[PDB]
């Protein structure tokens with residue numbers, strides 16, 4: 001069995017190996033990369049996402065989100081307070097201001113320590129979930145806006161055409177901006193490209209151990225768990241590495257830098273934080289191996305999670321017994 005300890009693997013495809021996305025995902029899996037829940041992919045040196053990042057300041061962040069924490073330093077929830085619109089140029093200035101800028105630090109480990117000690121005492125502002133792309137149209141390899149759609153994958157595997165579209169999203173971050181513990185909608189894959197700026201630290205639980213994380217989360221967030229049997233779908237809970245280690249939860253950590261891709265695998269729980277001003281682009285995708293995970297994915301039916309349009313068809317076709325309850329939660 002490849003990668004039996006579920007370590008995060010790092011890949012260096014050549015330019016020839018970068019031509020066929022599906023084939024390279026399957027190759028990574030042949031080496032056991034999915035067992036970690038997360039892999040890093042460093043593009044060939046011949047490749048670029050676009051020419052420059054000099055022309056992005058006029059992009060609008062219509063609804064910046066202030067991430068306000070409740071709890072204790074290692075075990076907290078965050079809610080998102082909506083703020084007034086601002087451009088990427090305005091947000092970058094904000095991120096670099098004394099109130100929000102990254103503190104002095106020695107190395108990624110020192111910064112990690114400072115994050116976990118101090119995050120709850122501040123409320124950073126995140127430009128998350130902005131529909132759009134920064135890949136140039138003439139980038140032909142690993143262009144996140146030109147991947148095969150999940151609706152086409154389901155159709156090719158199962159035979160049924162479905163409605164819906166699949167497009168990328170941009171994330172503009174600052175120091176301490178946080179992504180809570182989650183798997184993807186319908187336990188899909190995701191791919192995430194860090195276009196520019198400061199790093200992004202990731203934590204991940206192997207898919208084969210995901211239920212251990214869920215059981216700890218129920219223990220640590222007992223009111224949230226009573227409210228919803230899939231409350232991690234709400235994407236609000238944070239648990240630190242120290243608390244995970246105290247509770248024997250298998251996990252790994254890695255830091256992504258500008259110019260690097262990360263792939264999350266079906267049912268790989270992940271969480272993390274940004275080091276400073278940065279911009280990432282992400283999208284979900286599927287392969288034939290995903291179908292069996294989509295049929296078994298949990299769902300939030302309590303009202304909170306409120307998802308995209310395009311999940312309807314995936315629940316309807318893959319999970320017909322759950323569909324009527326799920327849709328009641330959507331309304």
Ligand SMILES: O=C(O)CNC(=O)C(=O)O
Pocket residue numbers: 128171178179190191192200264280282283
């Ligand atoms: O960078 C972010 O805010 C979120 N990271 C991820 O959830 C991902 O690409 O799967």
Ligand SMILES: [Mg+2]
Pocket residue numbers: 055056057058059
């Ligand atoms: Mg612009």
Ligand code: NI
Pocket residue numbers: 182183184190264270
């Ligand atoms: Ni994700």
Ligand SMILES: [Zn+2]
Pocket residue numbers: 227228229230231233234300301302303304305
């Ligand atoms: Zn719920």
